[PDB]
Recover the amino acids of this structure.
């Protein structure tokens, strides 16, 4: 006759303690914040990116605070580099339990002025690289046989188009569907949950042209933000850790709204 | 030069300890589970519903496990009863910090056989009651001046129609938009976040004609569940507590996917 | 070996000639335009609304141009008035083949200042009335046994919330799901297609405060209009007639985007 | 005081007579049907594809029925071939007014068994080729200065994931967002409307293992089809011609539902 919920489950459901979290784009604005948040929450953090100097600086900062972390240099669009990077993570920590995909690139340009090569450059850096990293990490999680969590950072641009964004919106719109299809491929058979988060823009990225009366960018975002402010990377730490823990075990194939209401107004 | 995320924030972001959580439909399958989960997580729980016998049984069960809880009897569609119930919660705990709306009703019937009165009965019990409870609790949160969290349980039926569901789908589809509009009304000015969760069906609700070969209900849901199983109410505890804590402070006006991939396949 | 498409089908697929089109809210900005467009396209037009003076003026204008039309006075939220109005249409024209639902009401107000009675007033006028008219017309189409077309005018607000719109967004968000559920109830068994159109605002409705520098309404819509201008009612004539003809025979349960890109940017 | 709609507009709004319609994937199941429908509706049809034998057979069939048509051989992923093909269309007809993109490719495979090269093959043939054709045709429409219409055939898979579809769903999900972004780039400044149609599957594509009791494909689609049947290519002729005519002048950046209710149930 007792309610079907366990105190031990509730007390520990948000935990990532002792889990190995592999973070791509770890040197980025969101990547460095998520990497340190996983570390602060007790995960072993394996950071990856192309920028070795920035990875080394993060590793030193984190180790000084007792975070168990390491890094591997790799271009996420290059499958041989990604494969070798996962091998190094596995040699260091024995397994991969959580993957957070945060790397990305954009170069807005109207379709008329944007060459096919320039559109492809965005697709390779932002979309192909998501397939590469997810395929190779999912294979590693399958090989382990313990399930796993994959969190892909897309954008609110995955669901709304924008002038100059034929490259970025195709990549992000595609990645949200890639995520839903990966959940169809992996969740039931292997216990690997695959979800995306769709953020709005960060405040720091709009600071340069913020004081220009000729620019409406900063204003356009605020009229469209029911939350009442632009985001900071720390605003998505809760959602990412939620999607990386037992608390979200039933959640898969979702494209989570991190827009502060931009998507629903 | 340090990464912009604080250890104290990460360690405590999912906390609901010491918060007053008011749960409607507390006697229901999800309501009783969410009410006990808030209690296990250290919130003061104020349970509400029309069924006094069931509320008393939950209060006794919870108190035996050291949960600080109370109840108030009210029909959530009755604004005088809802106002008296919130006053009773305030007399007991001094404030309301979290609201979880879980009550509901359905009676599927084809439009041709469903009277206008029967469609209205579903709208009153399932949609009007959401407006009543959210309005009165939001007013109480405004009066306190400390912000708050509102979590409305809608359904994956808020985004997908179904035969016999002209009542329920209108109510749920409407409640998702009511939530997005409430965030536009309250989040920026008052710090009240308003979100919904959109669950798929519970396993226990399909168990009776599960052994009936003439029924395709049980199988229809499984072909459409990438997660690979039907849900239990405890599968939504993580999402509800996430949306009731500091970890989701930037998240407002969202209609969160709790479908296990039903919405994205 | 011939391509599977018929010239006779292509030549006549957009036709509404000789069909009986029942238009609710016929006295409104969109209603009068749609009613005259059905007439110009050769349909028999039965106009309905509460405003008899305006219905009489439209009937005289249309008859002077050789349009076969008639009217019936009814409050669309009142099932006895709707039932009697359909009987009068059937006595005049023998059947109903197309239904276009265009009536509506809004009174924006923040949830804190909007009474439950005021929210209900919008729900009754804008949502309940859609259920009433669709149920009674669908029953008439079932009784005829020749199928039919139902086009419900909702709003882009059916998918995006807005400050002060807890009444209107609930009603419109609900009506889109009611439409999808009605298609589940009626399309396969009775050949009745049920779709909605989701328009952006009309230019004429924003003309009053257009010259006010303190108002950002007119500007906010234009930043969010990829089409580059606000709409006129005549801009939705094509979509409504398309959804009322053989050209859309496979299309049902859809919530059609008439936003000029507001929904997708 | 007359209603704001013109008889001349209503009578001619669905016309494509005398317009030059360039159809990609013209040899395909939908392409051949759309190409002949444009011809039957009086457009000059320029068919393109890689299969010359099939293009020649369609040209002979169409000319025998008085259709003014021509063809140009090109791989739509090859920008030099696409540029030469558009030049050939211009040499033949002097301009391009309508573009219908219907070519595509799929090879379903689980992410674990699908190489990065195989995923890229689908992206190139199904997504990159859409960018190539739309960019070069949009440039031609800009050069003419008379506006234009672009209709991209995506899939209901642009909004719903599926097992084995990480290639196809990324491509289609991306193309819907590419369409919305192209409307942001072109519609206001150049009068070029850009929309997609999202079809469900064709009956003929499921006929081979339809008699196989071990297969649930045929039944899975029918439980999810409120329209009550699988589609034929001719079922999308109305929507494509609607989106290619004056009747849809305000419609841009839309991803039109051609799913028969699969998307909304
Ligand atoms: N910031 C914002 O306002 C928003 C961002 N997004 C998206 O969210 C993600 C995180 O954003 P944010 O942290 O600000 O991103 P950043 O601009 O800080 O970039 C993240 C990291 O991506 C890597 N990167 C850059 N270019 C490429 C490339 N050509 N190929 C592969 N990797 C590359 C870099 O790491 P390294 O050089 O070490 O490889 C960089 O540090 C990105 O995908 C971004 O597109 C979504 C919504 C809004
Ligand atoms: N269970 C499922 O499979 C799914 C449920 N949902 C929705 O999620 C919510 C929670 O579901 P679940 O816990 O299973 O629901 P229940 O069937 O257990 O009902 C929840 C509570 O609602 C109250 N209630 C019942 N009828 C009415 C009414 N006429 N007016 C007001 N309150 C009423 C009852 O409490 P009391 O008598 O104490 O007032 C009941 O205990 C509901 O809104 C449901 O519609 C969504 C997706 C799937
Ligand atoms: N105009 C716009 O900018 C937009 C409008 N919409 C919606 O599209 C529809 C058509 O818009 P539009 O033509 O401009 O609307 P109108 O403002 O012109 O109203 C349409 C008709 O609805 C009837 N009506 C008014 N109040 C009520 C009520 N309380 N109960 C029942 N019927 C009522 C009136 O007819 P009578 O008095 O004869 O009964 C009126 O002529 C409406 O539902 C509107 O909400 C959607 C997007 C934007
Ligand atoms: N048929 C269905 O059930 C559904 C189809 N779709 C999509 O709608 C579109 C039309 O469908 P349908 O007519 O049945 O498609 P088809 O299978 O008949 O293919 C369309 C044409 O695409 C061309 N094509 C094939 N492979 C490639 C390739 N590698 N690169 C470039 N072009 C290629 C071929 O023309 P050629 O050899 O002359 O170049 C083919 O005739 C496609 O994009 C399809 O993916 C969407 C929903 C369901």
């Amino acid at each position: 006759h007792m309610v079907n919920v366990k105190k031990e489950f509730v007390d520990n459901m948000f935990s990532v303690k002792g889990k190995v979290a592999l973070v791509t784009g770890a040197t980025g604005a969101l990547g460095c914040v998520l990497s340190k948040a996983y570390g602060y929450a007790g995960a072993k953090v394996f950071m990856t990116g192309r920028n070795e100097k920035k990875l080394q600086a993060l590793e030193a900062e984190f180790k000084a605070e007792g975070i168990d972390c390491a890094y591997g240099v790799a271009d996420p669009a290059d499958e041989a580099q990604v494969d070798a990077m996962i091998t190094a993570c596995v040699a260091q920590y024995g397994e991969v339990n959580i993957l957070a995909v945060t790397h990305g690139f954009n170069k807005p340009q109207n379709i008329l002025e944007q060459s096919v090569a320039d559109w492809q450059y965005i697709m390779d850096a932002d979309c192909k690289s998501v397939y590469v990293v997810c395929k190779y990490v999912a294979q590693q999680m399958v090989d382990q046989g313990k399930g796993g969590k994959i969190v892909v950072v897309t954008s609110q641009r995955s669901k709304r188009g924008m002038a100059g964004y034929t490259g970025y919106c195709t990549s992000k719109g595609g990645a949200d569907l890639m995520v839903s299809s990966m959940a169809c491929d992996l969740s039931a058979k292997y216990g690997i949950n695959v979800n995306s988060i769709c953020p709005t823009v960060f405040r720091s990225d709009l600071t340069e042209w913020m004081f220009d009366p000729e620019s409406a960018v900063y204003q356009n975002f605020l009229k469209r933000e029911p939350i009442g402010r632009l985001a900071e990377p720390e605003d998505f730490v809760g959602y990412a850790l939620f999607l990386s823990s037992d608390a979200s075990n039933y959640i898969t194939g979702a494209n989570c709204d991190c827009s502060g209401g931009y998507l629903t107004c």
About this structure: The CA atoms of residues 142 and 190 of chain B lie 6 Å apart. Strands of chain B lie at 20-24, 44-49, 69-73, 98-101, 148-153, 192-199, 255-258.
